[PDB]
Amino acid sequence: NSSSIKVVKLLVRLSDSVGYLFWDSATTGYATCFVFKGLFILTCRHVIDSIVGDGIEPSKWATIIGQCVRVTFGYEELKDKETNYFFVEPWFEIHNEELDYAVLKLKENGQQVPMELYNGITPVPLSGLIHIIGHPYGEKKQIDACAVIPQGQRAKKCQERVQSMYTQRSFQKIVHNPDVITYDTEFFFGAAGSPVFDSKGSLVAMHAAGFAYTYQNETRSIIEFGSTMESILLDIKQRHKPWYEEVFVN
Amino acid sequence: GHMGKVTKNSSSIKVVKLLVRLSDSVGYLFWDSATTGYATCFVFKGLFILTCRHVIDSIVGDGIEPSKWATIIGQCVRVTFGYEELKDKETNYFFVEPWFEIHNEELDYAVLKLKENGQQVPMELYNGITPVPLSGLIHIIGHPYGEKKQIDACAVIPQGQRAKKCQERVQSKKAESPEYVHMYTQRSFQKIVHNPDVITYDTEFFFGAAGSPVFDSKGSLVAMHAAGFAYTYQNETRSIIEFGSTMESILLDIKQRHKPWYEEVFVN
């Protein structure tokens, strides 16, 4: 579970591109995001669901996002929670519900936009150590070193953890899913959109959600998963090819 | 790990940035004497660095006259602060002055002095006296197994549980098979069971990390990692519990036994 000083020195520099996204309009909430490419940031899709609310026509979604969403990258202490924030352009076009990702665009306000975290496609580790950087529980920015659950063991672990709410009939969407990476982390609450890097510090996935339960007045989670950057970028290449060529190759 | 009773392993970005700043003051100490070996040290105060006493025992050797120890140290010990990759293992190193006067066997600490050879002396890690945490999370920075510099976030074992937890692991692994064995004396384990001068924790730096600085959850130097209680099972070597001498005890011992040097170094 220990890491080398070199990798952690890389990770703390990368953490400046991990942001806290918050909104306070008709709905109130938070999430984690990160600078994907250029002025574009990446987060989860159910985050946008929380931002807009139920029963709203899609034609209005962008207008809502550009009116109430703020993103700050310097949230390391309580005082910095809702200060020095970028606005978001009223634009919402690149997303997918299955892979659970959403692309937003920051609005330049004369500040320094953090370095992009997408350096290229990095293969997903089948085992070993990973590092998740985000804002769990809406708290200050934190980093966690986590153990990866190999896909072939996903069906086992779950059934153990239930026998040691839900059923094994409910994990059917992640047990044999090669587009997600499973792991045991403490960032299982409100850390949607937190980047997940491999043991060398390369962006490999984005944390999605978990499965919460209560035990001795404390909220725990059975298993956590995230959408792999390979899957997200391939879906973007296929569904939004003009935007992909406009942003990524030039 | 969220299946049993677990302490939070994660840290905040602010504390981790502080710790990567402090790691530049953690040094890999290697020696080529009658025996060849390695350990960890850290810049204590000014040019002085702190490591473990049994490290000096391993450097000098058995039976050597004490009057020679210093002269051996300042001739064979080298310390590098940039061992973050394999290529930097024994590059850009300081020598140590032929000086060995401040040490203690019971608390297992030893003070050495770097020799300014043109290299950059790191920042000292001793700012003030920090109370020892009774529980929670700590961070160890060092060179375990002689590898590149690493940092581990570990769970503190409260003092009152030292007698409990340990046995719970012993009887857990010992009941299985008759090939289990401890590699430590019980007389050596009973010296930390009710000892407030050491802090105990569960870490992965139970090898070659002697002298590694141990910081609290906020990033303040609180202890120096000493040793562990190793046990082998199925030909794999684990450790029941690890411990470190608190900086409180070390500084008190320095004030009591070496008052002139303490006033010469710390107050003036």
Q: Determine the distance from the C-alpha atom of residue A58 to the mean position of all C-alpha atoms in its chain, rounded to a whole number.
A: 22
Report how far residue B211's alpha carbon sits from residue B165's, in angstroms, rounded to the nearest whole number.
24
Please answer whether residues A234 and A241 qualify as being in contact, where contact means their C-beta atoms are separated by less than 8 angstroms: no
C-alpha–C-alpha distance, residues A197 and A132, integer Å: 6
Q: Which of A35, A32, A56 is nearest to A44 (CA)?
A: A32
- Sign, CA dihedral A125-A129-A135-A140, equals negative
CA atoms of B86 and B96, how far apart (whole Å): 23
Q: Given the DSSP bridges, would you call strands A95-96 and A101-107 parallel, antiparallel or unpaired? A: antiparallel
Among candidates B3, B14, B141 on the partner chain, residue whose Cβ is nearest the Cβ of A161: B3
Nearest CA in chain B to A148: B1
Q: Which helix (H) or strand (E) holds B67?
A: helix B66-76
Burial class of residue A90 (count of CB atoms within 10 Å of its CB; 0-12, 13-18, 19+): middle
A250 touches chain B (CB under 8 A): no
Residues of B in contact with A136 (CB under 8 A): 10
Tokens of B54: 């049994």
**Are A205 and A122 contacting, i.e. CB atoms less than 8 angstroms apart?**
no
Structure tokens at B30: 């290697």
DSSP-derived secondary structure letter, B160:
G
Method of elucidation: X-ray
Query: Could you tell me the two tokens for A168?
Result: 């094994």
Name where chain A breaks: residue before each gap, C-N > 2.5 Å. Answer: 164
Which one is the CATH code of A129-230: 2.40.10.10, 3.40.50.300, 3.30.450.20, 1.20.120.400? 2.40.10.10
Would you tell me which residues 204-243 of chain B have a C-beta closer than 8 angstroms to some C-beta of chain A? Answer: 204-205
For residues A150 and A155, what is the distance between their CA atoms, to the nearest angstrom? 10
Of residues B144, B149, B153, nearest to A5 (C-beta) = B149
Rounded to 5 degrees, φ, ψ at A208 are -100, -70
Q: Residue B204's closest chain A neighbor by CA?
A: A2
DSSP designation for B216: -
Matching fold, domains A17-117+234-249 and A129-230? yes
Helix, strand, coil distribution of chain B in percent, nearest 5: 30, 35, 40
Count CB atoms within 10 A of the CB of residue B138: 23
Inter-residue contact A228 to A101 (CB < 8 Å): no
Cβ-defined contact of A145 to B9 (cutoff 8 Å): yes
What is the Cα–Cα distance from A82 to B224, expressed in whole angstroms? 38
| Residue A18 burial by Cβ neighbours in a 10 Å radius (0-12, 13-18, 19+) | buried
Contact A17, A114 (CB under 8 A): yes
- Return d(Cα A78, Cα A227) in angstroms, integer: 29
**Which of B8, B12, B204 has the CB atom closest to A141's CB atom?**
B12
Q: Please provide the CATH number assigned to the domain covering B137-248.
A: 2.40.10.10
For residues A29 and A127, what is the distance between their CA atoms, to the nearest angstrom? 33
Chain A CA closest to residue B147: A4
CB of A199 within 8 Å of any CB in chain B? no
**Amino acid letter, A75:** Y
Contacts of B3 in chain A (CB under 8 A): 161, 164, 184, 220
Please tell me the class of the B16-115 domain: mainly beta
Nearest residue on chain A to B139, alpha-carbon basis: A2
Helix (H) or strand (E) holding B141: strand B137-142
Residue with tokens 């375990």: B144
CB-based burial of residue A224 (10 Å sphere; 0-12 exposed, 13-18 middle, 19+ buried)? buried
Q: Is A165 on the interface with B (CB under 8 A)?
A: no
Q: For A161, name the nearest residue in chain B, comparing CA atoms only.
A: B3
Tell if the CB–CB gap between A142 and B12 is shorter than 8 Å: yes
Q: Give the β-pairing of A180-184 and B221-233.
A: unpaired
Expressed in Å, this structure's resolution amounts to: 2.7
Per DSSP, the residues of chain A read --EEHHHHHHHHHHGGGEEEEEEESSSEEEEEEEEEETTEEEE-HHHHHHHH-TT--GGGHHHHHHHHEEEES--SSGGGTTSSEEEE-S----EETTTTEEEEEEEP-SSPPPPPS--S--PPPSSSEEEEEE-GGG-S-EEEEEEEE-HHHHHHHHHHHHH----TTTGGGTTT-TTEEEEE-S--SS-TT-EEE-TTS-EEEEEEEEEEEEETTEEEEEEEEEEEHHHHHHHHHHHSHHHHIIIII-
SS3 of B128, please? coil
CB-based contact A119:A160 (threshold 8 Å): no
Q: Indicate the fold that domain A17-117+234-249 takes in CATH.
A: Thrombin, subunit H (2.40.10)
Residue A57 dihedral angles phi and psi, to the nearest 5°: -70, 140
Q: What is the dihedral of CA B247, B252, B253, B259, to 10 degrees?
A: 130
Interchain proximity B2–A184, CB inside 8 Å: yes
Question: A5 vs B85: CB contact, 8 Å cut-off?
Answer: no
Residue spans per domain, chain B = 16-115, 137-248
Number of Cβ within 10 Å of residue A53's Cβ equals 12
Interface membership of B152 toward A (CB under 8 Å): yes
